[PDB]
Design a binder for this molecule. Sequence first.
Ligand SMILES: Cc1cc(F)cc(C)c1Oc1ccc(C(C)(C)O)cc1-c1cn(C)c(=O)c2cc(-c3cnc(C4CCCC4)[nH]3)oc12
Ligand SMILES: Cc1cc(F)cc(C)c1Oc1ccc(C(C)(C)O)cc1-c1cn(C)c(=O)c2cc(-c3cnc(C4CCCC4)[nH]3)oc12
Ligand SMILES: Cc1cc(F)cc(C)c1Oc1ccc(C(C)(C)O)cc1-c1cn(C)c(=O)c2cc(-c3cnc(C4CCCC4)[nH]3)oc12
Ligand SMILES: Cc1cc(F)cc(C)c1Oc1ccc(C(C)(C)O)cc1-c1cn(C)c(=O)c2cc(-c3cnc(C4CCCC4)[nH]3)oc12
Lengths: 110, 108, 110, 108
Amino acid sequence: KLSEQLKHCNGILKELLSKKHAAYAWPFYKPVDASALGLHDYHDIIKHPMDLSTVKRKMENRDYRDAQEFAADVRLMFSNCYKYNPPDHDVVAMARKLQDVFEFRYAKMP
Amino acid sequence: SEQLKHCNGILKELLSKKHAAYAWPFYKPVDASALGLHDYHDIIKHPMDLSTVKRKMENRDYRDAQEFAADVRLMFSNCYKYNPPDHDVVAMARKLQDVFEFRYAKMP
Amino acid sequence: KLSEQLKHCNGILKELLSKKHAAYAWPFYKPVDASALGLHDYHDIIKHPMDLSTVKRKMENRDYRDAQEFAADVRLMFSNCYKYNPPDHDVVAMARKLQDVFEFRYAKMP
Amino acid sequence: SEQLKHCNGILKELLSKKHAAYAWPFYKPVDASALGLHDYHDIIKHPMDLSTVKRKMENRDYRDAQEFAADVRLMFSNCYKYNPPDHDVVAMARKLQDVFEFRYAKMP
Ligand SMILES: Cc1cc(F)cc(C)c1Oc1ccc(C(C)(C)O)cc1-c1cn(C)c(=O)c2cc(-c3cnc(C4CCCC4)[nH]3)oc12
Ligand SMILES: Cc1cc(F)cc(C)c1Oc1ccc(C(C)(C)O)cc1-c1cn(C)c(=O)c2cc(-c3cnc(C4CCCC4)[nH]3)oc12
Ligand SMILES: Cc1cc(F)cc(C)c1Oc1ccc(C(C)(C)O)cc1-c1cn(C)c(=O)c2cc(-c3cnc(C4CCCC4)[nH]3)oc12
Ligand SMILES: Cc1cc(F)cc(C)c1Oc1ccc(C(C)(C)O)cc1-c1cn(C)c(=O)c2cc(-c3cnc(C4CCCC4)[nH]3)oc12
């Protein structure tokens, strides 16, 4: 019923992680390494971080009831990025490109 | 309505002359009959557009910013759902959504 | 201070991740890749998975409110190991050795 | 109550003759006076042992399995808190805790 939804959501997640979109997806593969980047205020501004490895773990853990919940985390990931950064920063451009793939594939599911 | 105040400012921003180049297909409902898109309402169960959002906003219908975001995203998802990716209107939806998602994510 | 006992919790996690314990801690660094190992029953038996990187990620994100919450997850990680496995499989021996490090350092906090 | 019955079986097992070689220091309270221990009650403010636990099981003072766990864990935790890591009692505590943690983990 909605296990078919989550099966399609799993397919989206594979696409998002795939090599073809890697030039814009790579900054969302792992949690932002605030420490390495020298960002003292990242966890002050982003209360609930999110990234695709996390989304994958929750997928495998069956933590998502339905596709809305999947989509809420994926959008959280992008919004965090837009929230933290100025609009001229390369990571924002990249988030936009990857959200295009996501919004498209998520619109086409049953 | 503190959080909704900024949502109303976003709406205003989406309707402004500056984004009209790519915002205009979303001002009114899609005229499916006029375009001869006979399958539009078969595929799109819940049509959405900026004037409908504005109508809702003017009437104090949004409870919180999450309801407002849901309708705006509904508008874009509808566009993406119905259309092939090569179509200009999808390129325009994406350009308008970038404006929306950015301004939404800076909500105080 | 809850942040002072969370600082200590952090110290413990650093201890758990250190090289002295790598011989036994390594099966707990990442989540158990059930899908990759062909453990079709794993997620049926284990409703809430845990591992050290998931703890680290929750620490970093300030998801833990006190030390008792930190400890609950670490014990969940080990319980899951004990629940899914027979008592003679090596991963059980390794879990015990790592739990023995954890419980001791947890006991020593103010 | 289905699970308190399974907990009682666990306590039964912790108290059985099998595990006596490492369980005996946990059968009754630490006799601090006898051992030569000025500071045991300063450092350990919530004493616990298997007999204590046994009474609370008989008196039906445990609401669920997790309250039962908490007490058994406390007993061990006390032993680890008070003692240096090389003490024979710590090694015995560990052997017994390995029995407890395993059977608790198999609770249906
Ligand atoms: C994509 C990209 C291009 C760059 F040129 C520089 C950075 C930092 C960059 O972002 C990242 C680079 C590396 C990493 C690692 C691998 C360490 O986790 C993460 C990012 C990154 C990912 N995401 C989702 C982000 O939102 C942000 C945000 C930032 C960031 C770095 N510096 C800022 C400052 C810049 C001045 C004002 C904000 N923001 O870096 C990332
Ligand atoms: C934006 C745009 C650019 C073009 F070059 C041509 C069209 C039709 C076009 O779209 C519209 C033009 C006018 C109007 C009016 C004013 C009548 O409401 C609506 C659209 C339009 C808006 N939105 C949101 C849409 O999703 C679609 C979709 C279409 C459309 C027309 N023909 C198609 C087919 C082509 C094969 C499969 C899709 N789609 O038209 C619109
Ligand atoms: C620790 C260990 C030693 C071995 F000699 C073989 C394996 C598979 C092994 O376990 C793992 C190996 C790799 C990984 C990766 C890195 C893929 O996440 C995980 C484990 C592993 C971690 N934890 C915490 C576990 O509880 C279990 C359990 C198992 C496991 C594999 N096959 C079984 C069945 C076989 C029949 C009875 C149990 N259990 O593998 C892991
Ligand atoms: C298990 C064991 C082996 C030994 F070789 C020596 C002791 C004291 C020992 O522990 C106990 C021996 C007897 C008893 C009696 C029967 C009197 O209640 C208790 C213990 C004992 C139980 N538990 C749970 C404990 O936590 C501790 C702790 C100690 C203890 C005594 N002296 C020390 C050292 C630690 C550094 C300061 C002196 N630790 O003894 C016990």
